[PDB]
Design a protein around this ligand. Structure first.
Ligand code: NA
Ligand code: NA
Lengths: 545, 545
């Protein structure tokens, strides 16, 4: 049904024993809650003071004055490291479980194991195997931060975004605000510190991926919620993050249900003020990222989540130090009344999406505005997170990946390419292969990608265009080998100085027909094996007067 | 912590395999939903026509005019048969899991196994053992309907109320509106029909216990609820019945989560109109009960649940045939506005409790109005439903039960005594012992209980009074043996014709002291061993002029 005898399929160990962390949720309440809330209050005061004195205030109009940095316009390619406890089971259906994005989500396994993936989980892992039993299996024994960074450098990428904290709240950094962190649970290392250090050594821009909301969080309450509640003054905070209907804002807390879903999380009174804001601040202050990649901002509107304050802080602390950027996932600017009207009834929803420097279409590019900056995120397959089933049949070829990349870049996009390791931190050879092919292609063709801008036309048949910033170099990316002759129909107004195929030093002949078309004879010597010069896509650089 | 080697503790069998009912929820949608909704629509039309033409209308003012029948005033003792799939595990904590009533609830195990009782369940039954895996174990191999009816008769009871349908929706009767019924699942018999036939044979008034709401019900919907929903047009209806915060009114339906919680339930569009009303009507029409014992009426207000229509129907179909009664659990008459104000903020809640013929204090009697009719429900322990742990330390003695019963009856109450069999249908010996003592007491003393009314004084020291309905007999229930003389301080205005101790034919002489006290010498031959005549409580019958 779901359990195979395939060695590649991660499955329950014969030596499985329940993971009961040193501190229960109640232990954390008794021993750490007051300490953390005290620390949080002092950190939030500091952040609020920075914003009071700073250029950027926590409001849409102030934050809108921030500009996309040159480096982000220029980067074109980033690497998105989708690694966390979900990497251990490494499962989504190959087909039929797609979200509205068109992607599938192995990286939602921690949540979906109780519902959509429950049949699989029960057969492969066991009904008695809880979410947190994946944490000790996230060993990282094969995870080498510097090698991942070198892989990204070699691929042609210009930024690297680790999944620093996803929806179940495990932090890749050693945080003072949670024990659900990479040092205490899983690999026993500050993975983010290692990646940040590697990024500095290889001169790579570094992101900070941060889920605003979490699926469940233990909170301190005055009144209990039902006559059945076993533990006074604790409940479980839930917002819209899970998407499926749930109890909101509070569910009754039951240790035998909840503890092994929330190991390490310290109860607080106010999820946002006492935990989310100070942990954001901590990571920014300690690691100094170039980019914030919010996610999970649909949990609560920003009036509640207070992400305009984290955004203002990020920009203010960067002033005079570095150029930084934020995606568009902080959350909604809608009022309670407009959120009600959306539920009762997309037009109104989009009117409330007003925060961030760039758009983030996911998997499906769709109807992007090419006049503004955007970034599409996806892996080589539909899967966000490792899928042990992913293979040649399910994944883009190197060829397809390169052609998609070119299309993205011509249309003003960046590609944020997801790579998804297994529980040990090993990258599947198929993903490594596609990175190698992209990198090998970029070694020849990168000047037509990095630091370019859209042209007046993006596409002509099988050809995609980019231009240099100054407009004096036009790049024609042919996704089919043009053979004996390259003909360009789109009018070129300026005089032409010369033409070359990237990967060859030889200057090409060229003439303008009277109808305006460009004719470019291709040397016979290239026709035998054009892939020797460049594989899959052949890029011609046209120098203008 | 919870799994013992005690043979009395019900636990997972070594031969366990998942119960996957021959009809899945989706099968029932495809194969039965249309037929059930066809029948439902016709039955609702018929019910509405009966109410249009009948004396009682489905509104508070009309229903209030219905009076408690003489038989219910007279009955004093009923048997409440708390038997269902929960009887198999037979568990609640002996202490510390009490509800607001003061009772504990083994009969909530099907719901609480996922939260409050989850540690026990996981250890004793297994996380892979689902709610519906209890249904095949409800064998009824030791359940004999005639014997249960005779147990009620011999105990002195005058009505018998089986748990015909509790909160998870298993019906004791063979229903065309659900396959979660006693013929298709569990004992393979129409249990209710057997009890109804026995009740007719032994001239016992019969109840119909009916949970208005159910914890979960599969419903047919136009739009799905999330991008993760695997099955088009099905969802799970939930209201306030579960008490703990939940998704309401709809949860996303996931077969691997829900199917083994809702085996047998046929999806409908409108839980109330397409299932609740017609199933109520079916049982009333087929079995002709004398009493409706609503429960679980806190799920939805009556504006939504439509229980004023089922109440009017019950009265109307009985009118001119038999005198019938309804408890006070149909639900709330509050408006949406008042329900909101209750949630934001007991006074308002009680103002909306306006339907029914009598009050139903549960376990805790509290400050009852003795001028109106009331009925307390409880077992001999705090436990509603079988608790394998219940023992002499946890349970009222026969002595304590009889004294409590006398107190109830002197104060205008009925006792609806809960008896709780195990999964096979066997009654625990401790419960049998208490029934033996109560029945032996009633064989001597029942004339002082049945057909009586409160007197002008209810209690004088250790003495409780009742009077015959005709006013010609006063019964003095002494909870301590009076010894050589029975002295009654309360004035008796009427002349006295004769006095006897029930259980003895001896006519007792008496004098009035000058202070007015009645002085009744007690024969020497009673003094050594008065318990031979009657145990625990001695009742003197005073015949008046
Ligand atoms: Na801006
Ligand atoms: Na009435």
């Amino acid at each position: 049904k779901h359990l195979t005898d395939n060695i590649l399929q991660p499955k329950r160990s014969s030596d499985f024993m329940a993971f009961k962390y040193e501190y229960s949720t109640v232990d954390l309440y008794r021993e750490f809650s007051e300490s953390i809330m005290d620390k949080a209050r002092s950190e939030v005061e500091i952040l609020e003071s920075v914003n009071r004195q700073g250029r950027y205030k926590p409001n849409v109009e102030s934050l809108k004055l921030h500009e996309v940095p040159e480096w982000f316009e220029d980067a074109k390619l980033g690497i998105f490291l989708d690694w966390g406890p979900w990497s251990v089971p490494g499962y989504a259906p190959l087909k039929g479980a797609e979200a509205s994005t068109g992607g599938s989500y192995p990286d939602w396994y921690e949540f979906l194991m109780d519902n959509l993936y429950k049949e699989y989980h029960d057969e492969v892992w066991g009904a008695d195997f809880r979410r947190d039993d994946f944490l000790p299996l996230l060993t990282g024994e094969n995870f080498n931060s510097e090698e991942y960074m070198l892989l990204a450098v070699n691929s042609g990428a210009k930024y690297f975004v680790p999944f620093t904290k996803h929806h179940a709240g495990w932090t890749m950094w050693e945080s003072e605000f949670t024990k659900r962190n990479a040092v205490e649970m899983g690999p026993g290392r500050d993975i983010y510190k290692e990646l940040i250090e590697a990024g500095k050594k290889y001169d790579m821009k570094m992101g900070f991926y941060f889920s605003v909301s979490e699926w469940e969080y233990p909170v301190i309450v005055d009144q209990n919620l039902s006559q059945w509640d076993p533990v006074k003054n604790l409940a479980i905070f839930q917002d819209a993050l899970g998407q499926i209907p749930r109890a909101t804002p509070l569910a009754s807390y039951f240790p035998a249900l909840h503890d092994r879903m929330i190991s390490g999380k310290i109860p607080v009174k106010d999820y946002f003020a006492d935990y989310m804001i100070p942990s954001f601040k901590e990571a920014v202050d300690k690691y100094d990222p170039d980019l914030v990649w919010y996610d999970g901002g649909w949990g609560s509107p920003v009036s509640i989540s207070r992400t305009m304050e984290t955004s203002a802080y990020f920009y203010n602390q960067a002033e005079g130090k570095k150029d930084v950027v934020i995606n568009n996932r902080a959350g909604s600017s809608l009022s309670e009344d407009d959120l009600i009207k959306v539920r009762d009834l997309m037009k109104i929803y989009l009117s409330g999406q007003q925060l961030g420097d760039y758009g983030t279409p996911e998997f499906t590019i769709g109807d992007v505005d090419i006049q503004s900056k955007w970034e599409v995120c996806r892996s080589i397959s539909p899967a966000f997170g490792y899928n042990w089933q992913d293979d040649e049949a399910s994944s883009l070829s190197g060829e397809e990946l390169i052609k998609l990349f070119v299309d993205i870049v011509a249309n003003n996009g960046n590609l944020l390419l997801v790579i998804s390791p297994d529980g040990s931190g090993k990258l599947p050879d198929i993903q490594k292969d596609r990175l190698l092919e992209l990198g090998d292609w970029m070694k020849v063709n990168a000047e037509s990608i990095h630091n370019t801008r859209p042209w007046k036309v993006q596409k002509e048949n099988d050809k995609f265009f980019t231009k240099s910033k100054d407009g004096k170099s036009l790049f024609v990316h042919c996704t089919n080998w043009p053979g004996e002759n390259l003909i360009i129909n789109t009018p070129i107004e300026e005089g032409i100085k010369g033409i070359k195929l990237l990967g060859s030093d030889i200057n090409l002949q060229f003439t303008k027909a009277s109808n305006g078309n460009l004719e470019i004879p291709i040397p016979k010597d290239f026709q035998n094996n054009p892939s020797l010069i460049s594989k899959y896509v052949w890029t011609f650089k046209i120098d203008l007067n």
